[PDB]
Design a protein around this nucleic acid. Structure first.
Ligand SMILES: [Zn+2]
Ligand SMILES: [Zn+2]
Length: 106
DNA sequence: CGATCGC
DNA sequence: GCGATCGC
């Protein structure tokens, strides 16, 4: 299982602004030791880049209507799936999504 | 030995 | 380790 076995970061990401999560629950989605540690380290720098969630590392909750049942936070979708070639840590491949947006696509 | 996302 | 949704 790739998502567990370790790797290193690649890809610059893309430039956005203060209203950057609105594009998570839209279409493709918003750009940006284990993926278990990389996700934290993503949202830990979301706190330090100018709330209580991100600061401890967790994913922030979404709007009520972009939630599906017990799925309620932002999700890092891999555009090109890992089983079919996709690089886990391709900062360029990861799309910030919401439970409903993510669900449709798949 | 489900895939794919979260804690 | 564990939890969630979808599954033609
Ligand atoms: Zn996905
Ligand atoms: Zn199962």
């Amino acid at each position: 299982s790739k998502r567990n076995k370790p790797g290193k970061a690649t890809g610059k990401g893309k430039p956005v602004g203060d209203k950057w999560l609105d594009d998570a629950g839209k279409d493709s989605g918003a750009p940006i030791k284990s993926f278990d540690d990389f996700r934290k380290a993503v949202w830990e720098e979301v706190s330090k880049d100018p709330k209580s969630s991100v600061s401890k590392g967790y994913s922030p909750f979404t709007p009520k209507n972009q939630q599906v049942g017990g799925r309620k936070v932002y999700e890092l979708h891999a555009d090109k799936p890992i089983s079919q070639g996709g690089e886990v840590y391709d900062m360029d491949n990861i799309r910030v999504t919401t439970p409903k947006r993510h669900i449709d696509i798949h």
